[PDB]
Design a protein around this ligand. Structure first.
Ligand SMILES: O=C(c1c2ccccc2cc2ccccc12)N1CCC(N2CCC[C@@H](C(=O)N3CCOCC3)C2)CC1
Ligand SMILES: O=C(c1c2ccccc2cc2ccccc12)N1CCC(N2CCC[C@@H](C(=O)N3CCOCC3)C2)CC1
Lengths: 681, 681
């Protein structure tokens, strides 16, 4: 293209054009999308703030002589391998002074973004770089899978020993090389390119090739090993640092697994996440079964799956989502969660409230709802809800949110029935579309899976506190759900709670209820160190429902002796039912001591803001002790800590306790590093 | 019953009869089934050995004044709660001097084996008892779920305020008590049995009951909390000690979850594992959908599921299976795996061998096969294979086995196609039976799940080494398997390998092959500390299959320039195919360094016996260091250790190295506790 306003980009670097033809942003152009999204981040936070370009820095990382990664300021497109990386330091609303993270990306223009040994070792190096520093690892996937190839240097000179040169079609018995070919190899030192055995046939000495190795690296198994390396590296990263992947273009094989192993994934529309491509599958099956890879790894598959937590219309959209996702995540492992107070102060009542006779969208209880007569504030900061895995197991709603600025994970129950429509298998003529009804307030294998998945993703990397607006009547005990292993996924929940390292809040909502199976799997005793449970005064909880209670311990026989109070069954049935429902009240929960407090929905936001803050504060103090004393149970540490509180401070006063602690961080700090003389040997 | 030979048992204890009517062994009679099974254990080991009753001891455990568990020798049936336990010390072939473990069981005769607070705290206490001592925790489930009930003391005197005594049917507005009733309660101190509010209606002062609490404990939520307690306790136990559960009778609610949380489960035939019973489900749905609980939790469900690892014809059968399962498990956490050498010495060739043109049952490669012309020894000790999860995901075969006495976990690939027949959902008129073809040498969501599940169960509790006869062409990339999240389960594999704490051996079999996706997820670099990979000389491995290799890097264009060697496509296609297959040879794997050694199947058993032994020996030494020095990488520790080997010892000689180490345990022990002066402060 001639006569363009500015210096033609796709020409100074033709790769940029190739990247675009492929349908993805050019790898070296990504850092810019992060600057843009970071800018947009500030615009939404404070429309006024004036930004300087030094608010965002991106330094490429390449390996030096020692194989050590360093920040080099070189020109785009000069990458020797098909894998690039950048260390980004950017000031954000949560981290005004700056926060860092790394970005690793395949370079789709370099050998179709294949994964070769060199790319794998680079990928592994970078992942370790991030983990060491405890900073997030963002991965931009646009690849073709493990790199392949043959020993091309052996294709022009391989001879075949036939059954008779007269009729080649009669077959052969082995391939070989002539003493001439053997020399050709020896001339280029490409001798180890083949394992042979010299054997003199009546004709001449022919070297039978028993194995082809190849002089060039990255043809077969050496590539598979590299994949495993990064697979294991990523599995490890997920429990260490915040991990997220943007499928910016096709992602195949190891590329697909890398997406899942980092768990958190945002898939750009039309960018398939696949194992074996459609063409190759059709070939293998002989028939033309599939049309596009999108049938195998499109959003309609992976987003409905749960592999994709979110979808994006285009790369920039995805980058914005990543950046938005990180706003609730600590700057680096073990730092306090990033607090970001906004216009929505904590001191206000909760507007929206559910009704036992009015279908509602739990999201309204969460973020709030916009009505004709104004806006109804929910429990959390307005506009702070960031839902994820929204295309899978709609039975539960999971997302990040803020409570007076305090970021946290949130799990709500979808009350409306879900219409899960499963496509037909194009590989089966007998395959037919199927609609699955997913009853509200009930766990099914997929919603139990999504719950545990959410819990683990909140805990690992994100290191976030969490609140579950628990409201389930139990797990589906039907035969289908039971056959589909609902017991394994329910247990996954228990496992994930036991692993949680941040404060957890279980709260049964106003019109909510927690019954039998459901209560079990979320009870605070599962993790006494981090869990606390609260029942709204208008919530219900019992081993069974009122109906089941009368159906077992209020039989017709007992209903009769009751007739001695005044056919009439229609109303005496409602007397027993109500008799039972009177046991399932928060008051009994308090009386029996299974919950910490019965709360009032409208006053919840206020209460939880201070409880969470008071707890985050005591936790910080609890850890400082841990990494100082050594032998001492939690009970002991928290006691030694609360013993430092002024005599006049009411330990049960969340605000008071939180306020005092924040006013004495340094005094307490001395008190801590004063216990250094705790060298019990 | 009169005139019976010996003292009538079901009469001295009527409970025994009730237990039997229920279809299960009487809880106090179980210790005897363990003695029997232990006896049978010896009979099979050495038919000669003469046993004394002191070879087996069972002491009941109950809580003392302090709530501490102690061994009391009291008479059967005297249990105050509906939960019993026994500490069993028994001499076995693996542990001639004795090995211990605990047995906890519901007492189905006590309040239908319900789970009340008291039973839960007892259950939790016992589980902690075992964990502390690191001994196995066997659980015998026969229960009815969380205990329920109402405030019965409030049913004879609750008054109802109607709209008019004339027409009760017109409804009411609230229940209450008379100053007389209030007194009745006060007389028995059962005052906290109800939360009320006095209000004088034109008539008289009536106390409105706002909440019913109940004087008796174990009616509602307090039971759900106890369940959670033991759920979390069991989730924890699984990663700590060897856990197993025998569903000896119905197991419900928390009872069902307890089964899954302990993971390893043996289900007696006809004993359902359920959440909500069929009757109650039918009631809730109005219609008569299900006939028996077996449709919901029978073996046809749970055994096909994977929830049940094995099924048993009767209790004794199950006990025998438990006892058999434990024979490969260490006496208690962290002890060496129990070695048990039998007639099948290590020094022999491997008989059975697969053929590329003859369907075989991988189990023959494992245990061996019995032919008409004698017995063909497999890779492992004859009669030592103990398969588990045999009713689920037949695509893979998992079990325990011995290699010259060394117990280990084994994962083999089923080559035959699996005919998975899924039942119809009786709750859907449109539901129809469905047969799923599961292609051999291919991972599907369920077989990938079973693989990871097996790996984790081998690692946790069992603490066993493991060998995987890896032979997969890859994961199914079809749309159905892909939509059914095959990527999540494949990754579960990577996760489980990263967690493995014992030596691992990956071995591609004689006619086996490991391709693309499959290699990735099992490569040694995933866990360099514990993994090692070996390829049989007759195995194949490549990123793709030969066909796919020619289909990409040996196109018709290149096939032509090849025509310059002598329509003829049918044979020139086989020349290219063979050209590719020449890259996929173990020789290249060695050349490229992705495997440790290429082996010969017949000599495998011999080789692996010494490699595994040499490794178990070095591991022991590696740990002793760890729990002594502190800061030192694996690389350093193993080097400091191999530096102690005599100069003449060949580090690569497994037998030599193992032999020397075993001949110097105490000399090495001194060398270790000599590094105590390693007090770097
Ligand atoms: O309390 C009862 C109950 C009865 C219990 C015992 C005897 C008779 C009962 C009758 C009941 C009638 C209506 C509702 C609940 C009843 N429960 C039985 C049903 C329980 N559901 C929990 C949530 C999932 C439900 C379930 O398993 N499903 C949902 C519908 O599809 C089939 C599978 C079961 C809740 C507790
Ligand atoms: O090597 C090939 C291959 C080709 C690759 C690239 C271009 C053309 C190919 C043609 C092939 C033709 C026959 C076999 C393999 C072929 N592979 C493609 C198929 C791969 N399978 C791995 C195991 C599971 C297979 C799969 O996804 N299935 C199994 C059948 O049901 C649909 C889903 C795919 C194995 C690797």
């Amino acid at each position: 293209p001639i006569a363009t306003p500015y210096p033609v980009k796709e020409w100074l670097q033709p790769k940029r054009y190739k990247a675009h033809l492929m349908g993805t942003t050019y790898v070296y152009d990504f850092p810019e999308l992060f600057r843009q999204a970071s800018s947009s981040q500030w615009k939404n936070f404070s429309a006024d703030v004036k930004l300087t370009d030094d608010f965002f820095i991106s330094n490429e990382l390449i390996e030096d002589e020692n194989g050590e990664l360093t920040e080099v300021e070189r020109e785009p497109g000069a990458n020797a391998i098909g894998m690039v990386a950048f260390k980004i330091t950017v000031k954000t609303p949560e981290y005004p002074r700056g926060r860092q993270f790394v970005v690793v990306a395949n370079d789709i223009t370099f050998k179709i973004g294949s994964f070769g040994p060199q790319e794998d070792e680079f990928f592994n190096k970078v992942t370790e770089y991030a983990r060491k520093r405890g900073i997030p690892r963002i991965y931009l996937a646009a690849n073709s899978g493990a790199r392949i190839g043959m020993a091309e240097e052996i294709v022009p000179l391989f001879q075949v020993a036939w059954n008779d040169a007269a009729n080649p079609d009669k077959g052969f018995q082995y391939l070989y090389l002539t003493s001439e070919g053997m020399e050709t190899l020896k001339k280029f030192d490409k001798e180890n390119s083949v394992l042979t055995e010299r054997t003199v046939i009546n004709g001449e000495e022919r070297f039978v090739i028993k194995t082809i190795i190849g002089s060039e690296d990255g043809l077969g198994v050496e590539c598979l090993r590299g994949s495993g390396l990064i697979a294991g590296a990523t599995s490890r990263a997920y429990h260490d640092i915040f991990t997220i992947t943007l499928v910016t273009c096709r992602s195949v094989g190891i590329g697909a697994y890398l997406v899942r192993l980092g768990q958190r994934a945002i898939q750009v529309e039309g960018q398939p996440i696949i194992l074996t491509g459609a063409p190759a599958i059709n070939k293998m099956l002989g028939r033309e079964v599939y049309t596009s890879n999108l049938q195998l790894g499109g959003t309609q598959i992976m987003y409905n799956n749960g592999v994709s937590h979110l979808t994006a219309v285009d790369d920039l959209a995805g980058v914005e989502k990543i950046v938005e996702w990180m706003s609730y995540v600590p700057a680096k492992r073990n730092m306090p969660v990033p607090i970001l107070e906004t216009k929505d102060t904590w001191d206000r009542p909760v507007d929206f409230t559910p009704t036992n006779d009015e279908t509602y969208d739990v999201r309204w209880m969460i973020e709030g709802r916009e009505t004709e007569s104004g806006f109804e504030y929910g429990l959390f900061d307005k506009g702070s809800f960031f839902e994820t895995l929204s295309g899978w197991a709609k039975g539960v709603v999971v997302g990040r949110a803020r409570l007076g600025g305090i970021p946290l994970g949130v799990i709500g129950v979808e009350t409306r029935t879900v219409e899960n429509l499963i496509p037909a298998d194009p590989a089966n003529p007998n395959s037919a579309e199927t609609l699955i009804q997913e009853p509200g307030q009930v766990w099914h294998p997929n919603s139990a899976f999504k719950t545990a998945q959410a819990i683990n993703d909140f805990n690992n990397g994100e290191q976030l506190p969490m609140m579950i607006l628990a409201n389930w009547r139990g797990f589906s005990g039907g035969q289908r759900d039971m056959f589909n292993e609902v017991l394994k996924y329910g247990s996954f929940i228990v496992d994930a709670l036991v692993d949680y390292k941040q404060p957890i809040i279980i709260y049964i909502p106003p019109t909510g209820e927690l019954r039998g199976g459901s209560w079990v799997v979320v009870d605070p005793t599962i993790n006494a160190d981090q869990m606390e449970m609260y029942a709204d005064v208008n919530a219900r909880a019992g081993v069974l429902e009122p109906q089941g209670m009368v159906g077992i311990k209020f039989r017709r026989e007992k209903l009769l002796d009751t007739m001695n109070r005044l056919e009439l069954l229609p109303i005496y049935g409602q007397i027993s039912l109500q008799f039972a429902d009177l046991h399932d009240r928060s008051s009994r929960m308090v009386a029996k001591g299974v919950i910490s407090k019965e709360l009032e929905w409208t006053e919840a936001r206020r209460f939880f803001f201070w409880r969470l803050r008071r707890r985050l504060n005591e936790e910080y103090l609890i850890k400082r002790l841990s990494h100082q004393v050594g032998e001492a149970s939690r009970l002991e540490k928290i006691a030694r800590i609360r013993s430092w509180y002024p005599a006049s401070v009411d330990h049960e006063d969340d605000r008071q306790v939180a306020t005092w602690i924040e006013e004495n961080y340094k005094t307490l700090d001395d008190k801590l590093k004063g216990l250094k003389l705790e060298s019990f040997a």
